[PDB]
Amino acid sequence: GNYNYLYRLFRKSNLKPFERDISTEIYQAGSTPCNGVEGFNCYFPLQSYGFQPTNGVGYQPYRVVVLSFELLHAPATVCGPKKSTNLVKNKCVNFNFNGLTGTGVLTESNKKFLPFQQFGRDIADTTDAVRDPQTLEILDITPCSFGGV
Amino acid sequence: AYTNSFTRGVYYPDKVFRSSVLHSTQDLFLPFFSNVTWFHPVLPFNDGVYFASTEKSNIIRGWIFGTTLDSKSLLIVNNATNVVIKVCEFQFCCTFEYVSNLREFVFKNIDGYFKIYSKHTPINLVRDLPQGFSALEPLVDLPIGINITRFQTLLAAYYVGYLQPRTFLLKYNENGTITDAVDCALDPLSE
Ligand SMILES: *[C@@H]1O[C@H](CO)[C@@H](O[C@@H]2O[C@H](CO)[C@@H](O)[C@H](O)[C@H]2NC(C)=O)[C@H](O)[C@H]1NC(C)=O
Ligand SMILES: *[C@@H]1O[C@H](CO)[C@@H](O)[C@H](O)[C@H]1NC(C)=O
Numbered sequence: 180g181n182y183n184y185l186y187r188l189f190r191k192s193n194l195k196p197f198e199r200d201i202s203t204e205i206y207q208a209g210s211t212p213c214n215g216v217e218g219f220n221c222y223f224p225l226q227s228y229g230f231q232p233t234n235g236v237g238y239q240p241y242r243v244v245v246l247s248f249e250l251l252h253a254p255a256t257v258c259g260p261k262k263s264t265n266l267v268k269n270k271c272v273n274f275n276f277n278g279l280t281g282t283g284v285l286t287e288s289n290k291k292f293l294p295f296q297q298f299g300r301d302i303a304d305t306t307d308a309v310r311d312p313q314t315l316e317i318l319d320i321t322p323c324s325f326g327g328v
Numbered sequence: 329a330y331t332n333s334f335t336r337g338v339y340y341p342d343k344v345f346r347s348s349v350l351h352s353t354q355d356l357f358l359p360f361f362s363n364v365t366w367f368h369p370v371l372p373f374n375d376g377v378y379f380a381s382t383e384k385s386n387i388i389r390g391w392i393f394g395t396t397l398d399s400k401s402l403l404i405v406n407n408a409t410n411v412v413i414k415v416c417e418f419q420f421c422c423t424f425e426y427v428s429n430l431r432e433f434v435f436k437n438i439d440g441y442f443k444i445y446s447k448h449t450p451i452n453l454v455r456d457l458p459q460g461f462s463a464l465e466p467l468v469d470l471p472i473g474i475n476i477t478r479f480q481t482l483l484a485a486y487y488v489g490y491l492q493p494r495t496f497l498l499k500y501n502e503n504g505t506i507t508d509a510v511d512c513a514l515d516p517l518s519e
């Protein structure tokens with residue numbers, strides 16, 4: 180029986196998202212103050228898992244990894260295996276800047292981006308300008324010509 | 329002591345550039361014309377804090393955060409030329425380690441992330457915070473995941489205010505800097 184893995188069994192309130200509580204304060208389950216002394220209604224908040232190879236699959240140990248990432252609002256440092264391509268201006272093209280995809284014309288801009296800002300936005304919440312991930316230059320995005328026939 | 333936080337405490341709520349627009353956004357802000365406490369001590373960290381310092385030789389350097397604040401919590405300290413943030417249960421009179429006029433900071437703890445915004449601006453005044461407007465761009469997002477209910481500075485007077493969930497109407501100019509704002513609950517005209 181492997182008892183090295185623990186879980187918190189008691190707590191005065193539920194955890195907020197991504198909160199981390201490693202405290203070992205004695206939990207007072209009754210009206211008697213514990214004063215740091217374990218006993219009746221005074222429990223150690225942690226309890227060990229019972230992991231034996233003969234245990235049922237429901238009681239078998241599982242390893243869990245949760246990847247948390249926030250999507251495009253700022254410069255990025257973790258990308259997929261996707262390759263890159265040269266850049267062409269003044270022609271309607273399909274652009275993909277750091278996973279932000281779209282279609283339009285990219286032109287030299289006069290916008291003054293701050294170091295923590297990746298891409299701009301239009302009044303319609305559509306992207307208006309972007310920062311080229313390889314060259315620190317601001318490209319203005321203008322949808323290419325259209326109209327009724 | 330107490331003083332009036334005329335229009336300060338506004339910070340870029342998003343890392344997205346905008347220009348020549350009036351954008352409305354709701355978040356934890358410092359209400360306009362609020363009573364901010366002036367210290368020439370431990371304080372609560374209810375829902376975020378606006379801190380301000382006027383310095384001549386940079387006496388104030390550090391912050392302590394936590395519930396009990398004594399070896400059972402965050403610590404921040406500016407050693408000469410190196411910001412140092414730790415979450416060890418330090419001994420004062422580890423699961424994280426980070427290493428890098430008027431100064432204004434905003435501290436927020438949302439979903440276990442500690443957001444620190446900080447501006448800087450020269451001023452010639454010795455009474456209180458000057459009247460004016462400026463925006464506090466973000467500087468740090470920290471994945472502490474640590475409970476917060478109190479803080480205390482470490483040092484030159486300073487100013488402390490508290491944030492509330494108030495809607496604001498930020499004015500982005502041609503160059504993308506917030507030049508003006510309107511608290512949506514300050515007064516009838518503001519509404
Ligand atoms: C973070 O720590 C604070 C301690 O300051 C917790 O607040 C306590 O919550 C319990 C819940 O029943 C109350 O009985 C205490 O009176 C609270 N203490 C204070 C000083 O207000 C808070 O619950 C903790 N956060 C979470 C998510 O549990
Ligand atoms: C990445 O691109 C920039 C500009 O395109 C260049 O200066 C830099 O050397 C490149 N880095 C590598 C590792 O090739």
Ligand SMILES: *[C@@H]1O[C@H](CO)[C@@H](O)[C@H](O)[C@H]1NC(C)=O
Binds near residue numbers: 501502503
């Ligand atoms: C924007 O920057 C230009 C210089 O690039 C300057 O002339 C202009 O005054 C700035 N606009 C504002 C509103 O500060």
